[PDB]
Every structure is written in C-alpha cells, then in structure tokens.
C-alpha cells in the first residue's frame, strides 16, 4: 500500500509524456518494490522523460523541410535550456543544436542557432556549458563551407573571450580559433582570425603578466605599459616576464633557505632548487639557481648544510654536458673554498673540484681546477691543508 507522495509520484510516472510504455513500467515496478525511494525515481524518471524529449525535438528539427518549423523547434530547445536550470542537460541541447547547424541547409538557420548558443554562453554562470559552447561553434566553423557562417562564429567566440575575466577561457577559445586557422584553405579568412588572434593573445598576456606572483608591482607595470606602447609583442614581452618571475622566484627560495632555522627545511628547500635545474632547460635560469644555491652555501654557518649544497652542485656538474655551466659550478665551488674558514670544508671542496678533474676529457676544466686549488693553496696558512692540496695537484698533474 502506498502512501500520498509515493501515490502522487505513481500518477506523476504515469502521465510522463516522453516515456516509452516499457520504461514507465519499469519505474512503476520499482515504485512498488520500494516506495521509500518515491522522490529517487521520480526524479529519475523525469530527468528521462526530458532527455528523449529533446532527442524527439532534435530529430524533429532535422526532419523539417519548413524553415519557421525549425525555428519553432530550436526555439523551443532553446527556451528549454535558457528557461530551465540543469547542469547536464543543456550540454546535450548544444551538442543537438549544434548538430542541427552542422547538417543546416540554409545558412539564415545556421546564424539563428549560433546566435542562441552565443547567449546561453554569455548568460551562463557555470564555466565548463561555456566550454561546450566554445567546442560545438568551434566545430560548426571548421566543419563550415560557407566563408560567412565561419567569419560570424570566430567573431562570435571573440566577443565571448572580450568579455570574460577567466584567462582559461580565453586561452582555450584561442586554440579553437588556432585550430579554426589553421584548416582553413581561404586566406583572407586565415588573416582575419589571425588578427582577432593578436587581440586576444594580447588581452591574455595582459591578464597573464597582471597574475604572476613574483615580480614587483613596478616591473610588471612596466610589462604591460610596453605591452601597451606595442601591442605585437606580447609573446616577446610575457616570455620576459615569466623568466623574471621564475628568476625572482628562485632568489626567493634561496632567502627562505638562509633564514630558515632547520636544517630539515633547508635541505628540502635545496632539493626543490636543484631538482628544479635538473629538470628544467633553461640555461641563464640554471645559472641563477647554481649561483644562488652557492651564496646559501657561502653564507651558511652549519658544516653539514656546506657539504650538503656542495655536493648538490657537484652533482649538477657530473651528469650536465654544459661546458660554461660545469666551469660556473666550479669557479663558484672555488670561490666557496676560498672565503670558508673551516678546514673540513675546504678539503671537502678540493676533494670534490678533483673529483670532477679526475672525470673531465677537457683540458680546459682540468686547468682551470688545477689553477683554482693552486690559488687556494696560496691562500692557505696551514701546512697539512698546503701539503693536502699539493698532492690532489701533482696527482691532477700526472693524469694529463
């Protein structure tokens, strides 16, 4: 026996209009067998009775040899995605009015469907349906014969990315619009969009080059005022600042390496900087880092953290094919040798300058380590550590 709601819900399933007798029957049949769940099925049930009934309108609409019939239709799907309020559903009525565009004979009914997916995305708060809108236009352009229906929709997609504040929606309508170009036979549809691409590439580095954590507000001020002086290098001009900011970026992590009171942390700070240059490829921003990583080791007042960084550098040095790189790690190793004032660490860093001696197949590192152990031992006043470094010499003398 029911109940008033689980009754209700039984002659709601039963009036269903878009429901096959079968798939009633099966909602009835589950009513009976729990009525407890009377709301689940009902909802579920609904949310059926909609979805086919779109794909009846859809089928509908492509049937229509009368172009207000269509209209009538696609308004209906329209006001039924516009005037209602579900997340999923709507993405099936773009992709059914978007199929509607893509098999349109006439090019008035193509422009009228376009222009309904153009509002549903520019009244919509919910940022993955304007995603699907992006896809489905971007798919009628490339899919398009007509050059016009082409032209309206990449300007369409442009007026939707000049109104947005979410930079991941402007970079994808970017790709689309690349995408669009680039299988595109028609040359003056190709420099068209090429021209609507330098709008928006420039809106994007702007918003890009205002979001980037690590630059002062000066230099990015400066960035976009030259991005506004010549707006045709915004490639040039944000490549510029992203270098900045991951040079500042990493000058930052080394300060927060030196002020940091555990030697925990630090290691970890020094195994994200090394780990970085190790997998990053830019030269000048390797370079930085093993400068930096040098004056944490320079300034540094634990033996253990010397020895840490040093062997982090030496490692850098072993496994890079970099000839200025390896002989900026050794002249900055060097240097730490000379300015430390603790014997274990000089011998350690005379240890490991020999080491990469001893590894080289180039005489130009090889004397350059052996000039840098000669000034060190120089320099030195003790005599174990003199006669130390006169043997890692004439040792590196009798190698080559």
């Known amino acids: 026996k029911f109940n008033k709601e689980q009754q209700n819900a039984f002659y709601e399933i039963l009036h269903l209009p878009n429901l096959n007798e079968e798939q009633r029957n099966a909602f009835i ?6 009525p407890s769940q009377s709301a689940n099925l009902l909802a579920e ?4 009775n909609v979805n086919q009934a779109v794909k009846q309108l859809a089928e509908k609409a492509k049937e229509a040899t009368d172009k207000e019939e269509v209209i009538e239709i696609v308004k209906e799907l329209a006001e039924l995605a516009k005037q209602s309020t579900d997340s999923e559903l709507v993405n099936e009525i773009v992709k059914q009015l ?20 153009a509002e549903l995305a520019k009244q919509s708060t919910d940022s993955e349906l304007v995603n699907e809108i ?4 971007a798919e009628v352009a490339k899919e398009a014969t007509d050059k016009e229906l082409v032209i309206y929709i990449v300007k369409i997609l442009a007026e939707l990315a000049k109104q947005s504040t979410d930079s991941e929606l402007v970079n994808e309508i970017v790709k689309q619009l690349e995408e669009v170009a680039k299988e595109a036979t028609d040359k003056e549809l190709v420099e068209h969009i090429e021209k609507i691409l330098e709008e928006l590439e420039q809106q994007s580095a702007f918003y890009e080059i205002l979001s980037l954590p690590n630059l002062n507000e000066e230099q990015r001020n400066a960035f976009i005022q030259s991005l506004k002086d010549d707006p045709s290098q915004s490639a040039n001009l944000l490549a ?6 991951v040079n500042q970026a990493v000058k930052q992590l080394a300060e927060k390496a030196k002020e940091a009171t555990d030697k925990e942390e630090v290691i970890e700070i020094v195994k994200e900087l090394a780990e970085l240059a190790k997998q990053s490829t830019d030269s000048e921003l390797v370079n930085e880092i093993v400068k930096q990583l040098a004056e944490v080791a320079k300034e540094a007042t ?9 062997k982090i550098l030496a490692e850098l040095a072993k496994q890079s094919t970099d000839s200025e790189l390896v002989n900026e790690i050794v002249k900055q190793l060097a240097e730490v040798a000379k300015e430390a004032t603790d014997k274990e660490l000089v011998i350690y860093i005379v240890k490991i300058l020999a080491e990469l001696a001893k590894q080289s ?5 090889v004397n350059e380590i052996v000039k840098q152990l000669e000034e060190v ?15 890692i010499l004439e040792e590196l003398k009798k190698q080559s």
């Not at 049949?29 to 729990?34: I, P, W």
């Not at 049930?45 to 059926?48: M, Q, V």
């Not at 992006?134 to 236009?137: N, R």
């Not at 031992?377 to 043997?391: C, Q, R, Y």
Request: glycine share 0%; no cysteine; hydrophobic share 40%.
């Open 240 to 245: 510029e600042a992203k270098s900045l900011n």
């Open 29 to 34: 049949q589950s009513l009976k067998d729990d």
């Open 134 to 137: 992006v896809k489905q236009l």
């Open 377 to 391: 031992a120089k320099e030195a006043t003790d005599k174990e550590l003199v006669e130390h470094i006169e043997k």
């Open 361 to 365: 197949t180039d005489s130009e590192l």
């Open 45 to 48: 049930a609904k949310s059926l």
């Open 98 to 117: 978007a199929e509607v565009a893509k098999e349109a004979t006439d090019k008035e009914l193509v422009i009228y469907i376009v222009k309904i997916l």
């Open 302 to 310: 634990d033996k253990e953290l010397v020895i840490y960084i040093v």
